[PDB]
Amino acid sequence: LTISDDLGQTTLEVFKEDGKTLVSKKVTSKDKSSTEEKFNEKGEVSEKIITRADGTRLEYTGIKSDGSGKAKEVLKGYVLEGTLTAEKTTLVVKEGTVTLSKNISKSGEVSVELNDTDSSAATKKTAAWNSGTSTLTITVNSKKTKDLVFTKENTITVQQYDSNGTKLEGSAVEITKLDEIKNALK
């Protein structure tokens, strides 16, 4: 246990028997956020559970030596699962021929991409990602249909456009079930 100077960090770290090979480590910050890490026979990270201030966790399990592993993000009402690589993390939601990918870079840059394998020029879905607004805009038949704003509060919000795609209408609703995300990609 090593507490930082500003009395804000509680680094619950445990050594195996001597002080060379790490085993487990938990660091709790002031803003209710923790980063649990587990290690292997070598000393490279095996699991990495990171908790944000709002309670949404980003859990990494089964980290291999090459830098890969299993990825899953737990949220209020639904979870997003995927894979981590030494490049970036991808979280995948699939509905029919449409696959939605959420990308989290090693620098924290969140990216969202969409792909539809249908070859029809009408029903195929395409998306454009806005970095500043953090909204994925789904386009169908060269007209905008839905807006997918990914809030900094770790939630997915959908706002629908009009019949011509000129502007969004009504109010933007929040997603509380995984089936809702699948319904948006149909």
Epitope: R57, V74, G77, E81, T176, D179
Partner: antibody
């Protein structure tokens, strides 16, 4: 204490209609999804309908579509299932059930009620 | 639509034995969207396990869920006379939320 009370079932003729009611107490009704589950005599469980917290989103099985409607009243802490154009195969004990998956922890159907036995026959 | 198959049909065990209940899925079900339920006759079903690991606030340690992907298992370590109900495997990821056909745990005498 968390519990659910079901009412509205009975014996009706084929092609008739009846309304189910589920009274909720002991928990925040506005914060949970809700579901309808039926079970035919001597058969397994079959999910029927699902509703969002605010009632905007409703999902149904292929069989009951266009005939059953699920609604709720957050203020009255109640929930309903209108069942029009009843067929004989709809004879089952309909269990009102709380979703449970209302937060970060993933939970299955937390709460089940006693159920109401609806019988569709001539 | 995901279809869940439960094996065996009925399992005849004596109290105090260990019961292994397996549930097969037609596709790959995420480990975060599977549940186990118990229904004693004449009563409503009760939620036993969620997330394949969580015991749902009041179930003893005898009941234990495991498995991933296609095959999921629920094991009762030391059977008790009140444990010989019908058990159901359910997924709640994508609609329709389907249940298994059910396994009747019967006391073997």
């Amino acid at each position: 204490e968390v519990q659910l009370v079901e009412s509205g079932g009975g014996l009706v003729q084929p092609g008739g209609s009846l309304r189910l009611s589920c009274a909720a107490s002991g928990f925040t009704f506005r914060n949970y999804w809700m579901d309808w589950v039926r079970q035919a005599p001597g058969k397994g469980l079959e999910w029927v309908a699902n509703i969002k917290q605010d009632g905007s989103v409703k999902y149904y099985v292929d069989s009951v579509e266009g005939r059953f409607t699920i609604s709720r009243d957050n203020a009255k802490n109640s929930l309903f299932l209108q069942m029009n154009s009843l067929r004989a195969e709809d004879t089952a004990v309909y269990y009102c059930a709380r979703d449970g998956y209302s937060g970060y922890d993933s939970v299955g159907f937390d709460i089940w009620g006693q159920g109401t036995m609806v019988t569709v026959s001539s | 639509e995901i279809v869940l198959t439960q094996s065996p049909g009925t399992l005849s065990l004596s109290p105090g034995e260990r019961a292994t209940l397996s549930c097969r899925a037609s596709q790959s079900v995420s480990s975060s969207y599977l549940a186990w339920y118990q229904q004693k006759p004449g009563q409503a079903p009760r939620l036993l396990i969620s997330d394949t690991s969580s015991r749902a606030t009041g179930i003893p340690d005898r009941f234990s869920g495991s498995g991933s992907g296609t095959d999921f298992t629920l094991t009762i370590s030391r059977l008790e006379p009140e444990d010989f109900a019908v058990y159901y495997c359910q997924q709640y990821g994508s609609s329709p939320y389907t249940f298994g056909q059910g396994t009747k745990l019967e006391i073997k005498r």
